[PDB]
Amino acid sequence: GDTKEQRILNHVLQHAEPGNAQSVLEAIDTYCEQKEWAMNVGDKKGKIVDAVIQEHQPSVLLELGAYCGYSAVRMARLLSPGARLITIEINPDCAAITQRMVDFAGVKDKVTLVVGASQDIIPQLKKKYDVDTLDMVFLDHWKDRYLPDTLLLEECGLLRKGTVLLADNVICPGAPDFLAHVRGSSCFECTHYQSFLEYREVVDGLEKAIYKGP
Ligand SMILES: C[S@@+](CC[C@H](N)C(=O)[O-])C[C@H]1O[C@@H](n2cnc3c(N)ncnc32)[C@H](O)[C@@H]1O
Numbered sequence: 001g002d003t004k005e006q007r008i009l010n011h012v013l014q015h016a017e018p019g020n021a022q023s024v025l026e027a028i029d030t031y032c033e034q035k036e037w038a039m040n041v042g043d044k045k046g047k048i049v050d051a052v053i054q055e056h057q058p059s060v061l062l063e064l065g066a067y068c069g070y071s072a073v074r075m076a077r078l079l080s081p082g083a084r085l086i087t088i089e090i091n092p093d094c095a096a097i098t099q100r101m102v103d104f105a106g107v108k109d110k111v112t113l114v115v116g117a118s119q120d121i122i123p124q125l126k127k128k129y130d131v132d133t134l135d136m137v138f139l140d141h142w143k144d145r146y147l148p149d150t151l152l153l154e155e156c157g158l159l160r161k162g163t164v165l166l167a168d169n170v171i172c173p174g175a176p177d178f179l180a181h182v183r184g185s186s187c188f189e190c191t192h193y194q195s196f197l198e199y200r201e202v203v204d205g206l207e208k209a210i211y212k213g214p
C-alpha cells in the first residue's frame with residue numbers, strides 16, 4: 001500500500017466480489033469519494049459513458065489513458081462476446097494495476113492493455129493489432145493530447161463515418177482547443193453532456209463527436 005493506486009487496488013481485493021465488475025466499480029467509487037480522491041471517470045459521468053455505449057454498440061473500442069482500470073472495467077461489462085477494448089497507458093506502474101483490476105473483475109478476455117504513449121501506439125494499430133477502423137474512442141489522458149491524437153487517428157485512417165469520439169473533462173480541467181476544433185469542423189457532429197467532476201460538485205462535462213468523413 002505505498003501509493004494511492006496500490007491502496008485503491010488493495011481496497012478492491014479486500015471488499016469486492018471476485019469476477020463481479022459492478023462490485024469492483026462500487027468499491028473504487030466508495031473508497032475514492034470518501035477516503036482518497038482519484039481521477040477515475042466515476043459513477044455519475046460513468047452513467048453517461050454507459051448510455052453512449054448502449055446506443056452505439058461498438059465492437060472495436062479504443063481507450064486513451066487507463067490509470068487503475070476503472071473505465072476499462074466499466075465499458076467492458078457492457079460489450080458483447082467477441083468485442084475488443086484496446087487500452088493504452090504510458091505509466092508502467094499504472095499499467096500493472098490496470099491488468100490486476102481487469103483480471104479480478106472477470107473482463108480480461110475483452111481487454112488488450114498496451115504499455116506506451118498514445119502517439120507511438122496509434123500508428124501501429126492496423127499492422128500490429130489488426131484494427132481496420134474504430135467504432136468508438138474514449139479520450140481521457142493528458143488534455144494537451146486530445147487534439148493532436150484526434151488528428152493522428154484521422155491521418156492514420158482509423159476513423160469511418162459514424163466513429164464515436166467521447167472526451168472526458170471538456171470543462172474541468174478543460175480541453176478548449178479540442179472542443180473548438182470538433183465543434184467548428186464540418187467533419188464532426190457534436191453533442192455536449194454537462195455533469196460534475198468525479199466525486200465532487202465542480203461543474204464538468206463530456207463531448208461526443210461523431211465523425212462524418214473527410
Ligand atoms: C484520468 S487518468 C485515466 C482514468 C481512466 N480513463 C478511468 O476513468 O478510470 C489519465 C491517464 O492517462 C495516462 N497518460 C497520460 N498521457 C498519456 C499518453 N500520451 N498515452 C497514454 N496514457 C497517457 C496517465 O498516465 C494516466 O494514468
Ligand SMILES: O=[N+]([O-])c1cc(O)c(O)c([N+](=O)[O-])c1
Nearest residue numbers: 039040140141142168169173
Ligand atoms: O485534475 N483533475 O480533476 C482531473 C480529472 C480528470 O478526470 C482527469 O482525467 C484528469 N487528468 O487526466 O489530468 C485530471
Ligand SMILES: [Mg+2]
Nearest residue numbers: 041140168169
Ligand atoms: Mg478524466
